[PDB]
Design a protein around this ligand. Structure first.
Ligand SMILES: [Mg+2]
Ligand SMILES: [Mg+2]
Lengths: 331, 331
């Protein structure tokens, strides 16, 4: 048991007062056994000493999903759960007050006008770049302003960009202002534009083949439609409307990605649905940056393994970064 | 009546023995009055002297569609109608025997192999060039071989080309060899690929707005579906199967263009349907050349004004040119 060995080194290393070695030893131990209950528990206690309550609670919560009767994780989780709820609520309150300031700024303001036009091309850049698109911000600007092809670049990559433009224009023209319930048709019409210029056969229609997505196996094609019916019901439900808008938008994003209803364009379509929910709640649209790709996939994995909270927190931080930029620009 | 004046000059000019002036004077007169019964009749008699029986009969036939009791057109038409039927049949027999020779040539032949690969890119070039696409044969070859964009050319123009490639590949993979009836779905699946990369919203769905096409007003959108049902019924009918394949393929082309079922891609889709019918009858695919555009539109106009025979003859000549090239190349 190299797992059981690595932990005892980590605990010894902590006792001595070497945080950095202990840190790595805890990580090494959980790489060797990701379901190692005592390693999660002891790394949690360690994290609380650095004042990282959220991480400690994530670890205790994970431990219990494996061994729900582990006494040391249970006693600790019972303390941290209500505490982390309060910390998470307090962060939503900081976001709420930062949105109030941004909502207040006069609509004509020359600074706010400049920022919003840049973030349009910026959103297209990052949302395609995240899927492996190699086009630059300026190349994307050239494609959308002139409608002419960029030299020595794949037509497919350029068609992903005009697809994103057509989808966002459709959302802003037809959906953002529309009052009433979201429909499966709304999602199909978004996808039709996202993927239409790349794969017109598959655009606007459900995946017909089972796939692997990282370590995720999504619903079988035969179940995709019913899962999407249950999803849009949730989008229109009472409990969804009573969530904080950032949590509602984050969970809508995660649920759609989990279902993976299309052969491709699931990520791009989910990030558009997120921004529709946020904008309908009077939030600004947010952009998960190309550089955040690895963090993005890590919090999706944590959600798949049973805890969606790090994903929600990740979307909350993206939402705060977006607001900070707008406030800064108009201050 | 400048019409009545121009004719009398033409007749006088013919009496004297000046064919060229008379020719132009007859044309000038029919420009001024396209329904001028005596001008059509007298130009017909003139055409018979040059041994142009087909033109003379076209003119007599046109005269009678205006004035069905004009005695001089009627006596002439009654003579030329059965004669032109025989001449048209004899041309179909020359085409039939030229197809027999081409069908015979060994399938492995290195010369036949070379020709057919060139005509693929050649077909895409002419079918898009006819619709106003400014891309060159080599630019089209670069787009389809590399999938990379050509410098300083519109994405739309390049997407028309990958659409044509996807449609032709689909036809050859799924339709050409398939046995049984053609369906409306087959036509929608062709259109889905033809227009999918340019207009994914409209690809594979019937026109929802009334349009003008030259001087042609097609069926109103509310009638498009029923007209397409009647059209595919005709495609699968007994009378269609008993037509000469060239006449069947030409009339299928004309009927679909007349209905104009889509917002765009009607021409490209009709030329594909023509080549599917020809190839299923063991004919080679044909290409209406960019340079023939004006002749093409002239015979479509003659069909709209009540005589489809010049259109059928035009497709027959295109079919003979195609065969002559193949025979030449392998001789
Ligand atoms: Mg590049
Ligand atoms: Mg050019």
């Amino acid at each position: 048991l190299e797992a059981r060995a690595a932990l005892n080194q980590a605990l010894e290393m902590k006792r001595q007062g070497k945080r950095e070695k202990a840190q790595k030893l805890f990580m090494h131990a959980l790489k060797m056994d990701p379901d190692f209950v005592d390693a999660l528990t002891e790394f949690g206690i360690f994290s609380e000493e650095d004042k990282d309550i959220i991480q400690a609670d994530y670890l205790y919560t994970r431990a219990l999903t494996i061994s729900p009767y582990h006494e040391k994780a249970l006693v600790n989780r019972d303390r941290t759960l209500p505490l982390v709820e309060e910390i998470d609520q307090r962060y939503f309150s900081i976001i709420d007050s930062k949105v109030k300031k941004v909502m207040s700024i006069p609509k004509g303001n020359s600074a706010l006008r400049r920022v919003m036009e840049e973030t349009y091309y910026h959103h297209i850049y990052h949302t395609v770049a995240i899927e492996g698109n190699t086009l630059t911000l300026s190349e994307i600007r050239h494609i959308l302003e002139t409608r002419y092809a960029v030299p020595g670049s794949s037509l497919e990559e350029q068609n992903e960009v005009i697809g994103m433009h057509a989808a966002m224009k459709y959302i802003n023209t037809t959906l953002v202002s529309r009052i009433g319930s979201v429909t499966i048709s709304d999602v199909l019409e978004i996808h039709r534009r996202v993927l239409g210029y790349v794969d017109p056969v598959e655009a606007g229609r459900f995946r017909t083949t089972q796939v692997l997505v990282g370590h995720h196996i999504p619903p079988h094609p035969q179940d995709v439609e019913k899962q999407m019916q249950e999803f849009v019901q949730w989008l229109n439900s009472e409990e969804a409307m009573n969530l904080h808008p950032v949590e509602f938008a984050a969970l809508a994003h995660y649920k759609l990605v989990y279902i993976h209803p299309f052969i491709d364009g699931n990520g791009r379509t989910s990030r558009l649905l997120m921004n529709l929910i946020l904008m309908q709640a009077g939030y600004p649209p947010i952009t998960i940056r190309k550089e955040q790709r690895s963090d993005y996939y890590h919090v999706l994995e944590a959600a798949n393994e049973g805890d969606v909270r790090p994903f929600i927190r990740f979307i909350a931080k993206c939402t705060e970064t977006t607001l900070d930029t707008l406030l800064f620009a108009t201050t």
